């Protein structure tokens, strides 16, 4: 759809749509930028991620409202509308996974980009898993697990424990464990060692990096407080 617009204009308009809270537009602009074929900078990867997380975030929130109504009732209308939203959500997840597979991940050599894209891959398979009920549910769960696990292996080899991508990856993999894989003990163990090893590496950081890392550590702490 965006093939006739300059890459740089797509990026510029992506930022404008973020300011205007037009995240569907923002996602379409970043999709167009990705399809230019060039690798994405650190800032551009964030823009892509913010756009689609917000789009899929509203679809997940709506799916949960509708699936809760549907459960409390079990005419076809509630099921039909939940299925409509669910289908739209799956379409957005498939689009993100398609962009990662064509060709963001295969061209990502640096740990920061490769971990970032593998984290996204795990997240969007997680969102697919949240709505899955058929024969492919186990396969979707394992795809999320496989992406997260490769990201974790790289991040532990290549990044310091306070690295924000590393910390966000561990946070989300632990949510996966708790929420999708029925492994609350694995979720708690990962959140705690991630938090403890980040604590020990804070002394190496500047004030701004310290602020970045402790923000995400506090989300790990919030979950540990919820889960124990």
């Amino acid at each position: 759809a965006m093939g006739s617009m300059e890459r740089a204009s797509l990026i510029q308009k992506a930022k404008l749509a973020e300011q205007a809270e037009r995240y569907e537009d923002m996602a379409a602009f970043m999709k167009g930028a990705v399809e230019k074929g060039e690798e994405l900078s650190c800032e551009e990867r964030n823009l892509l991620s913010v756009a689609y997380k917000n789009v899929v975030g509203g679809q997940r929130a709506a799916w949960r409202v509708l699936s809760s109504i549907e459960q409390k009732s079990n005419g076809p209308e509630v099921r039909e509308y939940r299925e409509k939203v669910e289908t739209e959500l799956q379409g957005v997840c498939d689009t993100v996974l398609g962009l990662l597979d064509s060709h963001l991940i295969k061209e990502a050599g640096d740990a920061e980009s490769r971990v970032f894209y593998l984290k996204m891959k795990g997240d969007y398979y997680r969102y697919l898993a949240e709505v899955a009920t058929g024969d492919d549910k186990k396969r979707i769960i394992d795809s999320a697990r496989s992406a997260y696990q490769e990201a974790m292996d790289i991040s532990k080899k290549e990044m310091p424990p306070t690295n924000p991508i590393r910390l966000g990856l561990a946070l989300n993999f632990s949510v996966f464990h708790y929420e999708i894989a029925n492994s609350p003990e694995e979720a708690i163990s990962l959140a705690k060692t991630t938090f403890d090893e980040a604590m020990a590496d804070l002394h190496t950081l500047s004030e701004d990096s310290y602020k970045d890392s402790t923000l995400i550590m506090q989300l790990l702490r919030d979950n540990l407080t919820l889960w124990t």
Binding site: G168, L171, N172, V175, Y178, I216, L219, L226, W227
Partner: peptide
């Protein structure tokens, strides 16, 4: 219910 990266 739990927090993923926000």
């Amino acid at each position: 219910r739990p927090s993923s990266w926000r």
